[PDB]
């Protein structure tokens, strides 16, 4: 579409901007996939975590 | 040979049918598979032939390589119009080998030598 | 008969047939697709970084 | 030492339980069925005195005596300490002891398999785009057969 | 001469050392065992095969064809006892403990 | 000459890399079976880096080796990743090289003028086997000890020099600390020789160019290397990385024996001693003979035949596409080689003795038969001509 | 010199951004 | 290592003027049928001995085990 | 020509060895100061071989390292020869490279078109220093432990980031077992990188050929390498073997410090800490400046000046024979870099601080002045006619 | 042509054997 052409003209008339764009995309996508996998991991198996044992503080 | 011939042996006609099919589907003759880097006498046999025959050989080789890269085969009509096994190189090769032997017998040095790799 | 390879040199026609057995072409007149190419390739350069 | 260990058990050495799940074939299930598997010997076989019978041992006769028995321990959560519950808890503990890195491993694995599949898709597109020019080229050669 | 010197020095540097050769002979003690059974023992670096055979084992082992064995010998020379059979425990085939 | 500079890529500084990587001409119909050489190069690099970082936490002594490996896995940040990459990358490296070898066998790449390449490849294979076997010992488990014992005491079957060379190899009277430290040093040294042999192998290939799925002259239609085969190599590398990481992260112990998590104990023997999965064909061929001298000297024909394939000089067609009978023989040889692999991991009794003695016969009839097609087919143009 | 100066400015900016990210690595920035 | 005089003529088209992906999944069933019909013999010859030997070993082992019983 | 084989030396299988060792044209008036590169290659091969055989008996742990070395040197058949060859071949290797550098600095071999060779040489020198210093530790004596502590804690003179760097380099909070294991692995790895750098060095030399004691165009009168310079190199190697054997057999402990025969002890300290004899000029330079940051930031200008010698567009005459003042300055610098080494071993006190502060001034003033003769010698052809 | 070559081969074998008995000096053989 025209959005692809707009993005092309905005970002790629130089090269250092391209390098910065790649680095930023990497260090955003990393965080996004981390959040997604952590959330799915939490959802899959509820009740088994370390903060879910009912007797965690009764050996004083 | 008593059993290599297709005339008398039924396990050679099948062999030639298979080879002819596989050669036609790429459009090249059985003598096209001999390599000048392999034997070093095919180089002389090809060096002595007329120019047009060698040019047709090069064109056929390039056609087959393009076909293989594209992952396809010649159409059915250009498959019917094909003649593998129509030699152009056997007699010259036999003659070159005969001279090689006759020169070896009476002393004499070789005319060309393979290079150490 | 004239060679097939020489009849195509002295006949600069402009009606050209490519080999569509693998890749189809866009109809003549349509724009290029360079921007979409950069779009697709950045998504892998991110991963490699 | 090991000498005292063999002395106190009749010449049989009780092994180390750190890696006991990874060390034999099919660890988890082997340990569980071994614990819960002491049984009455079949007809026609006899065991020398000082040994016990267990079909889950290669040889048919083992040295250790049965320990897991109903009420052998008293939990702090109110769970009926049956032999099976105790065995399950023991095997879970031993599996954690052998492989303490399992969860971190699985998280990294999921993330990077997903990401690398995406990169494979991109590389395939890149390949096709580059080879398009040769793979649709047309040539005329002037030869029939 | 110099090349021979260097080659020999480097190749003999890899042979067994004085520490290992110092511990290469001794005598230690065993314990009792039932007739026809065995409890393996330990030495410098090699176990000890043991067997004090019963009557039927004596019958079966001492009554095999002599020529069919690739090293023809009878156990009477190999055994030092009418019932016992102590042989150094290293496999002469491949060095394992069979 | 070009009395003023044009490109950095044609200057003397980058002439070698340019000529042998970027502008080098290759056939344009190479398929995906030509990527495994580069893929094996990357596997070797992975092995070297991972090993240089494991050897910062491992102590070569009989009292400490097992506990130092477990210290790495339990107490160093990410150390489990290093150990799993190393112990599974050895297997990946062997897999890739086996596929490379069978590619070479199919399209008949050993023939003229490329027999120097084949001979250097065989030497590289020997170095690989020695390196892997020497390096399976340092963890000092049960299989490490007993595999070292069996294989290195198989060298006393030789006549009179036997016991002497075995005792000199072991550094003493049995497999103990001296052998461990010796093998560690050899393991750290051999892969650099492997690197040198690989570079020589590549130079020997580049002095004549590569073959192609057709086996014909290929000097009329060639394309450069970059960017046309770089992208194909890229596809291969990414698929390989997915496979490797499936091994590392979700099944890191399927390709090993459980007995190496028991510290070495010289008195008790395991009931079933085998080496890794990529030595089982040789191991089966070796135990197939009821004689020590014959068993040891039956490996020598394997390497002699593999090293003497290139020097038969009658066959004229290279690719197996136009050779039906040799193609069928190739597939049957592959099946037989897999059968040897499976047999090499079984107890030695019926019915495995016959099935362990016949496949060696087939594995040698392969290297005996092939010249006969050479001769019988050299005269094929004269019979089928039209 | 101006296009070259601003090209160098952009390259220095890329390098400085990467170096700053090396110094502090905030997960949720 | 040299080249040859050729005399050919070729036409080409730019990368950015032609559809790229749709070629993979165009007519899969006929390609699958061609591959199977062409390489059935190679598949047979590769997978025959393994099956035969496996069945033979299984049969022998079960027969021996069941004959050793009481 | 090429229609059948004449010589097996001119075949592809041995074409490049022929071209770069047998036939390679060299100027015919080269003197003996061109043998030390080959001699250094010999020394490097000796180090690699004796190392690969020494590391077959050594155990890198803080409980068993000193004992491993003593067991090697006291209990293995001929192991004393291996250990002494290693520990003295390091000294021989450093001596050979110092003579090599000074030869190249006399006949001005750094200048165009041979500055890529100079740069690769400087990189090689860094690799040599790193490898020797890392490998003086594994025997784990007093000097090993305290030298490692001092030198690797000099790395905290850097601003804020420095402490993290030091903690990462030590593997913990002090010098301990992790440092020993890490240092052993690095020591085993680095020499192969050193070999690769040497090969690149040699190819970059061969792409132009070598200089000559006259510093002039020398392409009209040249000869082959074999057999004319191979015999000269043989004479050099034999004299070298005599020198090496004298050190190995009749005085093997003269080139070390006695304190490395005391097992490591973190509580006591030796009263005199020094590094191995061939690190002393750098030590004196680093202790000359009374400031940690200045200490670390003095050695970087040293290597910067060394690596930026060949880029001063300068005088048109190379050989210092036709240059009286550059000759005198060369002898002054050579005397100074010996005085610096001798000072780099004495106690840190008067008078040694002044005589350790001025020599570095001179050692930098050498690189400062040298462009000025080039600029002022541009005009000799227009004056002395 | 054969005699000179075979004599030279035998003498080279003698030289190889002498070298082997130089490197190793066994009086038990
Ligand atoms: C490169 C060519 C330069 C030759 C360097 C000479 C050398 O390394 O031998 C000194 C070398 C250093 O060992 P050391 O001085 O006994 O060790 C310090 C002692 O603890 C006792 O220390 P000290 O009180 O004797 O003083 C230490 C001083 C010794 O002072 C001397 O130089 C004495 C003169 C000999 O050490 C040095 O001078 C080393 C400075 C040279 C380092 C590299 C210079 C770069 C050259 C450019 O051996 C000797 O001192 C005498 C050896 C006699 C044979 C000389 C043949 C040299 C080859
Ligand atoms: C495990 C114990 C192993 C011990 C050794 C066992 C060796 C068994 C080998 C048996 C195979 C036979 C080998 C015969 C070699 C020579 C045969 C030959 O044909 O050479 C001739 C040929 C050129 O001669 P041609 O032109 O054909 O004759 C002219 C006639 N007018 O020559 C050529 O074509 C040149 C081909 C050169 C390529 C081969 C070079 C040797 C192989 C390279 C591997 C060695 C590399 C090792 C690297 C590390 C070294 C330690
Ligand atoms: C061991 C130490 C060996 C040192 C290796 C020397 C460097 C190898 C040469 C690299 C190379 O590219 O050589 C190419 C060579 C063909 O050389 P050529 O036909 O004369 O044309 C090349 C034009 N530059 O193609 C070749 O045949 C390379 C030579 C084969 C390697 C044989 C090495 C034997 C030494 C053992
Ligand atoms: C060149 C080829 C080199 C290949 C080298 C390895 C070949 C296969 C090695 C192997 O062991 O595969 C057989 C595998 C092992 O079975 P396993 O259960 O471990 O042995 C009995 C112990 N209980 O059992 C399997 O079936 C796993 C499948 C492995 C690949 C198929 C093996 C072909 C033969 C199987 C049927 C006969
Ligand atoms: C036993 C030898 C049997 C073959 C004897 C000569 C028969 C010649 C022949 O053409 O056999 C054809 C057959 C497969 O070849 P083909 O006809 O091309 O089938 C292709 C189908 N996609 O067969 C073959 O080409 C391979 C025959 C297998 C060889 C087995 C050798 C043991
Ligand atoms: C840190 C170091 C880590 C280790 C690095 C690995 C070192 C391995 C050494 C292998 C050397 C590589 C061999 C090929 C490089 C080479 O020889 O370059 C030749 C070049 C000669 O220049 P020229 O003759 O003008 O080039 C045209 C003719 N081919 O010579 C030159 O001019 C310089 C070329 C440098 C090599 C390219 C990089
Ligand atoms: C900080 C306080 C400084 C105090 C000292 C200052 C003294 C004045 C320095 C003037 C420098 C030039 C004067 C040198 C001598 C002048 C005489 C002359 O021009 O002849 C050149 C002379 C060599 O004499 P020559 O030509 O070889 O005689 C035989 C020929 N038939 O050449 C020579 O004799 C040697 C020339 C080089 C050495 C003299 C200059 C050294 C200055 C050191 C600079 C820094 C060095 C640091 C490294
Ligand atoms: C009476 C002391 C003793 C008790 C307490 C004990 N064991 Fe054992 N255990 C032994 C002995 C003795 C052996 C060695 C058995 C042999 O070699 O025949 C052994 C062996 C084992 C083995 C190895 C079996 C194999 O196949 O090699 C496992 C697993 C095991 N025990 C699990 C357990 C578990 C789980 C518990 C806690 C419920 C436990 N043991 C408690 C004495 C004991
Ligand atoms: C570390 C091990 C190896 C490496 C790095 C390696 C690498 C390579 C590379 C990069 C190529 C050229 C690129 C290609 O054709 O894919 C090649 C070609 C070749 N290799 Fe290897 N290889 C190795 C092992 C082997 C082995 C063990 C053999 C045979 C036993 C072998 C036989 C061949 C052959 C025959 C070719 C010819 C290629 C052709 O026909 O075009 N290689 N190798
Ligand atoms: C410089 C190169 C290398 C170094 C320094 C190195 C180092 C090591 C070390 C320290 C170990 C013991 C640690 C452990 O077993 O967990 C080891 C094990 C091993 N190495 Fe290497 N290695 C190198 C290259 C290679 C190569 C090239 C291969 C195979 C081609 C290889 C194969 C193995 C194998 C199979 C093991 C067994 C580990 C196991 O099974 O647990 N290594 N290596
Ligand atoms: C392991 C260390 C070294 C080795 C093996 C080595 C080897 C060589 C060799 C073999 C030559 C040619 C032979 C000759 O001209 O004598 C050479 C030349 C040269 N080297 Fe090195 N070198 C080493 C260290 C260095 C260092 C550290 C430098 C400088 C800091 C250096 C600078 C030079 C120069 C300038 C030449 C030019 C030769 C000429 O002027 O003709 N080298 N080197
Ligand atoms: C593959 C290459 C090498 C290996 C395997 C190796 C191995 C070893 C080992 C095991 C030690 C400890 C034993 C002992 O200290 O006596 C050692 C010490 C040492 N190495 Fe190496 N080394 C290698 C290369 C080098 C090189 C190239 C140098 C260059 C200077 C070097 C310098 C030293 C020094 C100075 C020592 C200590 C001297 C002493 O013990 O007094 N090493 N090396
Ligand atoms: S030691 Fe008995 S078969 Fe190996």
């Amino acid at each position: 579409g025209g959005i692809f052409e707009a993005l092309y003209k905005v970002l790629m008339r130089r090269n250092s901007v391209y390098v910065t764009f790649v680095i930023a995309g990497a260090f955003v996508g990393e965080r996004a996939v981390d959040y997604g996998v952590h959330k799915l991991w939490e959802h899959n198996n509820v009740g088994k975590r370390y903060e879910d044992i009912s007797v965690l503080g009764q050996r004083q | 040979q008593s059993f290599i011939d297709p005339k008398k042996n039924w396990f050679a006609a099948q062999h030639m049918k298979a080879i002819s099919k596989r050669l036609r589907r790429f459009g090249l003759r059985y003598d096209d598979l001999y390599d000048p880097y392999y034997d070093l006498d095919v180089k002389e046999a090809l060096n002595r032939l007329p120019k047009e025959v060698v040019d047709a050989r090069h064109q056929r080789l390039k056609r087959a390589m393009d076909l293989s890269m594209k992952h396809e085969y010649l159409p059915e009509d250009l498959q019917a119009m094909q003649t593998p096994f129509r030699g152009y190189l056997q007699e010259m090769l036999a003659l070159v080998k005969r001279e090689k032997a006759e020169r070896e017998s009476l002393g004499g040095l070789p005319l060309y030598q393979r290079t150490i790799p | 008969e004239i060679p097939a390879t020489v009849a195509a040199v002295k006949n600069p026609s402009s009606k050209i047939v490519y080999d569509e057995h693998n890749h189809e072409r866009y109809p003549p007149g349509d724009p290029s697709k360079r921007a979409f190419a950069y779009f697709v390739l950045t998504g892998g350069r991110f991963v490699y970084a | 030492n090991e000498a005292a260990a063999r002395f106190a058990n009749g010449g049989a050495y009780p092994p180390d339980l750190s890696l006991i799940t990874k060390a034999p074939h099919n660890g988890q299930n082997y340990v569980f069925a071994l614990l819960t598997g002491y049984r009455d010997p079949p007809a026609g076989v006899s065991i020398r005195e000082g040994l016990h019978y267990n079909p889950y041992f290669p040889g048919g006769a083992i040295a250790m005596p049965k320990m897991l028995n109903d009420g052998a321990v008293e939990y702090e959560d109110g769970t009926p300490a049956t032999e099976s519950q105790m065995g399950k808890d023991v095997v879970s503990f031993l599996s954690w002891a052998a492989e303490p890195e399992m969860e971190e491993r699985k998280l990294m694995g999921f993330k990077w398999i997903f990401v690398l599949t995406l990169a494979l898709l991109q590389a395939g597109y890149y390949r096709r785009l580059r080879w398009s020019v040769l793979k649709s080229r047309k040539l005329v050669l002037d030869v029939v057969n | 001469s110099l090349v021979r010197l260097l080659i020999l020095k480097f190749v003999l540097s890899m042979s067994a050392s004085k520490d290992v050769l110092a511990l290469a002979s001794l005598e230690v003690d065993l314990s009792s065992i039932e007739p026809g059974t065995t409890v393996t023992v330990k030495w410098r670096g090699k176990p000890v095969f043991i067997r004090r055979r019963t009557e039927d084992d004596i019958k079966l082992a001492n009554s095999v064809d002599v020529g069919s064995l690739r090293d023809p010998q009878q156990d009477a020379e190999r055994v030092k006892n009418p019932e016992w059979l102590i042989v150094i425990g290293v496999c002469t085939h491949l060095g394992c403990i069979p | 000459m070009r009395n003023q500079r044009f490109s950095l890529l044609k200057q003397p500084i980058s002439s070698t890399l340019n000529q042998h990587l970027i502008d080098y001409p290759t056939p344009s119909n190479l398929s995906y079976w030509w990527g495994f050489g580069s893929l094996a190069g990357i596997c070797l690099v992975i092995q070297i880096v991972t090993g240089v970082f494991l050897a910062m936490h491992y102590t070569p002594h009989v009292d400490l080796a097992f506990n130092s490996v477990e210290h790495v896995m339990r107490d160093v940040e990410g150390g489990w990743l290093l150990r799993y990459m190393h112990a599974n990358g050895a297997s990946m490296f062997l897999i890739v090289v086996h596929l490379h070898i069978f590619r070479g066998l199919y399209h008949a790449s050993y023939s003229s003028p490329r027999e120097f390449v084949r001979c250097l490849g065989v030497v590289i294979f020997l170095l690989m086997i020695v390196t892997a076997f020497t390096g399976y010992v340092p963890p000092w488990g049960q299989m490490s000890f007993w595999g070292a014992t069996v294989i290195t005491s198989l060298a006393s079957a030789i006549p009179v020099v036997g016991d002497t060379i075995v005792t000199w190899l072991w550094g003493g009277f049995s497999v103990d600390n001296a052998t461990l430290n010796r093998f560690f040093s050899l393991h750290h040294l051999l892969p650099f020789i492997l690197v040198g042999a690989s570079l020589l192998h590549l130079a020997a290939l580049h002095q004549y160019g590569s073959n192609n799925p057709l086996g014909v002259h290929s000097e009329m239609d060639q394309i450069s290397f970059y960017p046309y085969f770089y992208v194909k190599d890229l596809v291969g590398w990414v698929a390989f990385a997915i496979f490797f990481s499936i091994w590392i992260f979700y099944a890191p112990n399927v390709l090993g024996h459980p007995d190496n998590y028991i510290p070495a104990n010289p008195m008790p023997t395991p009931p079933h001693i085998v080496p890794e999965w990529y030595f089982l064909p040789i191991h089966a061929i070796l135990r197939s003979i009821p004689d020590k001298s014959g068993g040891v000297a039956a490996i020598a024909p394997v390497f002699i035949c593999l090293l003497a394939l290139p020097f038969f000089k009658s066959m004229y067609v290279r690719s197996s596409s136009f050779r039906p009978i040799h193609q069928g023989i190739f597939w049957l040889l592959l099946a037989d080689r897999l059968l040897l692999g499976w047999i090499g991991c079984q107890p030695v009794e019926a019915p495995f003795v016959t099935i362990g003695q016949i496949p060696p016969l087939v594995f040698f009839l392969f290297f005996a038969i092939t010249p006969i097609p050479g001769r019988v087919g050299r005269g094929i143009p004269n019979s089928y001509t039209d | 010199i101006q296009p070259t100066d601003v090209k160098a400015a952009a390259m220095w900016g890329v390098a400085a951004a990467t170096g700053g990210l090396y110094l502090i690595q905030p997960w949720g920035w | 290592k040299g080249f040859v005089p050729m005399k050919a003529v070729t036409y080409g088209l730019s990368p950015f003027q032609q559809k790229i992906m749709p070629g993979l999944w165009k007519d899969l069933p006929t390609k699958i049928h061609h591959k199977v019909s062409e390489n059935w013999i190679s598949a047979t010859l590769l997978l025959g001995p393994l099956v035969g030997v496996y069945s033979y070993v299984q049969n022998y082992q079960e027969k021996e085990k069941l004959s050793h019983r009481y």
Side-chain angles (χ1 to χ4, degrees), chain G residues 14-26:
Chain G
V14 173
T18 310
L21 275 192
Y22 289 165
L23 185 61
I24 286 177
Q25 298 191 355

